[PDB]
Amino acid sequence: EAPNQALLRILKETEFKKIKVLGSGTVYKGLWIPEGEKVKIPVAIKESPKANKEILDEAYVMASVDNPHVCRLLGICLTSTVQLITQLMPFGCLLDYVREHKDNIGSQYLLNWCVQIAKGMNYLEDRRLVHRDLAARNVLVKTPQHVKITDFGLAKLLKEYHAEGGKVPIKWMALESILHRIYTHQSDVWSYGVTVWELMTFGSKPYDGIPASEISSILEKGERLPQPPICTIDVYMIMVKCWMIDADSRPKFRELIIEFSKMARDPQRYLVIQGDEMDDVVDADEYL
Ligand SMILES: *CCC(=O)N1CCCC[C@@H](n2c(NC(=O)c3cccc(C(F)(F)F)c3)nc3cccc(C)c32)C1
Numbered sequence: 001e002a003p004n005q006a007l008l009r010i011l012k013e014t015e016f017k018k019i020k021v022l023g024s025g026t027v028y029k030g031l032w033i034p035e036g037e038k039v040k041i042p043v044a045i046k047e048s049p050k051a052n053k054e055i056l057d058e059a060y061v062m063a064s065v066d067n068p069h070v071c072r073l074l075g076i077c078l079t080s081t082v083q084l085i086t087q088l089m090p091f092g093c094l095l096d097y098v099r100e101h102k103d104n105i106g107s108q109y110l111l112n113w114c115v116q117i118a119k120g121m122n123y124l125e126d127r128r129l130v131h132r133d134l135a136a137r138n139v140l141v142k143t144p145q146h147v148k149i150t151d152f153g154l155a156k157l158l159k160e161y162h163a164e165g166g167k168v169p170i171k172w173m174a175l176e177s178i179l180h181r182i183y184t185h186q187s188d189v190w191s192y193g194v195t196v197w198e199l200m201t202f203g204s205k206p207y208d209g210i211p212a213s214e215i216s217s218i219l220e221k222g223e224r225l226p227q228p229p230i231c232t233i234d235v236y237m238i239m240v241k242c243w244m245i246d247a248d249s250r251p252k253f254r255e256l257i258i259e260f261s262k263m264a265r266d267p268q269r270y271l272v273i274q275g276d277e278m279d280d281v282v283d284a285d286e287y288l
Helices: 049-063 094-104 107-126 175-180 185-200 212-221 233-241 253-264
Strands: 016-023 027-032 041-046 073-077 083-087 139-143 146-149
Touching: 016 041, 041 073, 049 073, 049 083, 094 139, 094 185, 107 146, 107 185, 107 253, 175 185, 175 212, 185 233, 185 253, 233 253
Parallel strands: none
Antiparallel strands: 016 027, 027 041, 041 083, 073 083, 139 146
16 A cells, blocks of 8 residues: 555635636636746636535545546645636537537547547556446546546545445446445446447437336346447447456456457447547646
């Protein structure tokens, strides 16, 4: 158990401008200007004692991660509403993005999102972190060519995690987790499988028209999400393996990287889609 020497940066509130509300749990668009640095960083600003301790837990995890497919923490601002400041992801969450652009999303984009998400998750596994809330809504889009995993509030650091009775997304959850509140990197792989299904259906809702309470018995009887129309058996077999009952039968993220990478070199063999064929601004990824 190695010492976590990550730096937590406190930001002066006078160092940034809130341009606009992005969504609302409120997120703002903004510009961070470290004083006398002559850079402007576009940022997202996520703005009760319980609220404060939970948001500081998230800041803790986000400050201990540094990977190109993991969300970046720039710093915090100490106010009574205690803001998280991160890199601005100008295209929003990936689930809204596939819903909005489904008629122009080709197989190349789909398979490389799958690669990049697997890279993010494999990195979180290397740092012994279990995300516990992986879903297309929690993947942000920096560019159509570059996505990052976000939302580490539920994440817990480590062989298994025994949780309490807080509210949980049953439809993205492994079955061990629904029944026994157990979470592992392999229960994260299950959520990855639902995530890929979300993408391949262009953002359909898993088990739509079913309440969370029946899900556990459905999965016990052997039922799974259907094969998306665009999906070859090759791709759909990968989802199904992510949904094995035996968690060590599920793929590892490093294996998922390899498989989707192979498929990304010939994407039309694996997905069938009709028609597939401010001067001082600095991106946060370049401000080190
Ligand atoms: C699926 C919901 C969605 O589109 N979101 C999530 C919540 C609202 C913000 C939306 N948005 C952003 N977000 C971010 O840039 C961002 C960065 C880091 C962390 C977070 C988080 F998780 F805390 F919320 C958000 N950027 C844009 C740009 C344009 C449009 C939208 C809607 C947008 C994304």
